[PDB]
């Protein structure tokens, strides 16, 4: 078990467990999950109303500094009514630790636009608005950045397929470039690789 399998530290696990229990006790208004994985990186799962209060707490308080802001994405999970998952990622300059603030959200109701306390979140929020459509009320400027202007569809969803619906070509008829419905030259074959036989017995969900 020891060679070529990465060992761990239970000490960091106990530290993050006690810290997450502490944060869960002292902000009871929005805490739903505080989960700790095997390799000690914290996850805090949050209702979509305490975005500004929880981030104003987590920027400060001298027990959890966490100035460094990272990724924002809202992992598209169907079979839910609240589809999208806004994932804040926070890194502490003072304590060297990573916490993942996963707040949940639906298709049409906005979360509260974290750019007010995080100046790094501006183009992150603009990117999420362009690729998904998660609206951000009380935001300075929402535009389409990382897509074409005349293109729409919010393509990083699961409803948007791999190929786009439109496809450009130049033509000398109207002496310019026009978009057409997509005419693929090949299929993009689909390999049914989801093999049976239960490779992980621990992660079995209870069937009906």
């Amino acid at each position: 078990t020891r060679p070529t399998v990465r060992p761990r530290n239970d000490v960091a696990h106990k530290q993050l467990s006690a810290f997450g229990e502490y944060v869960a006790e002292i902000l009871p208004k929005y805490v739903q999950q505080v989960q700790v994985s095997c390799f000690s990186e914290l996850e805090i799962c949050i209702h979509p109303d305490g975005v500004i209060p929880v981030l104003t707490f987590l920027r400060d308080h001298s027990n959890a500094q966490f100035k460094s802001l990272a990724d924002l994405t809202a992992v598209d999970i169907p079979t839910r009514q609240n589809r999208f998952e806004i994932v804040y990622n926070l890194l502490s300059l003072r304590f060297n630790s990573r916490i993942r603030v996963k707040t949940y959200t639906d298709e049409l109701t906005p979360v509260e636009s974290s750019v007010s306390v995080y100046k790094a979140a501006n183009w992150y929020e603009r990117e999420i608005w362009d690729m998904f459509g998660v609206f951000f009320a009380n935001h300075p400027d929402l535009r389409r950045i990382l897509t074409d202007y005349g293109f729409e569809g919010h393509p990083f969803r699961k409803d948007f397929p791999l190929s786009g619906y439109v496809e450009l070509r130049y033509d000398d008829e109207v002496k310019r470039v026009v978009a057409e419905p997509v005419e693929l030259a090949q299929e993009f074959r689909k390999f049914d690789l989801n093999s049976p036989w239960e490779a992980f017995p621990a992660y079995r969900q209870p069937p009906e």
Partner: protein, 176 residues
């Protein structure tokens, strides 16, 4: 451990301040740069005469996409579809049939030279070393029709040489 920069002061001693004034009004280290560049002028430049001298390489370059065959034997491929299963732009296209003999073989083995990113995964995935990334890299093709290889083009390209491919593999069949 840290070793930072730009922590000094301009020295208030008369010699150092008149040396900085001498560099300011006398254009000194500019001429020092001219001297360094003339020292690279008087070197011999390192160029290669391209059509006569070709630049050096490794025995494991990934080029031509050639095929191999058995010693005085038939086609080395089985059409076991591993290369099309691994091809990360799906440029391989295999349609397989057996012939009148009984051993399983092909019908259509197409490499798209447009989509081919030249990984090496089809070389590493081939259990019999049928497809081999070739040695030479000169395609330079005037028409887009001609950049879609057929299996017969690959067999002609594997029968224009094997001795290069065999020498490279026989040198380096021990690393991979």
């Amino acid at each position: 451990t840290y070793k930072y920069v730009n922590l000094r002061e301009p020295s208030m001693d008369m010699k150092s301040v008149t040396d900085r004034a001498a560099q300011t009004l006398l254009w000194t280290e500019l001429i020092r740069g001219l001297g360094m560049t003339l020292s690279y002028l008087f070197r011999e430049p390192a160029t290669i005469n391209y059509p006569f001298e070709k630049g050096p390489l490794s025995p494991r370059f990934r080029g031509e996409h050639a095929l191999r065959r058995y010693p005085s034997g038939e086609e080395r491929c089985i059409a076991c579809k591993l290369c099309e299963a691994v091809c990360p732009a799906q440029a391989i296209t295999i349609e397989a049939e057996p012939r009148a003999d009984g051993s399983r073989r092909t019908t259509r083995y197409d490499i798209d030279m447009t989509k081919c990113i030249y990984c090496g995964f089809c070389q590493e995935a081939c259990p019999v070393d049928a497809i081999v990334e070739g040695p030479n890299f000169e395609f330079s093709t005037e028409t887009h029709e001609e950049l879609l290889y057929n299996k017969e083009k690959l067999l002609n390209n594997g029968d224009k040489w094997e001795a290069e491919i065999a020498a490279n593999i026989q040198a380096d069949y021990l690393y991979r």
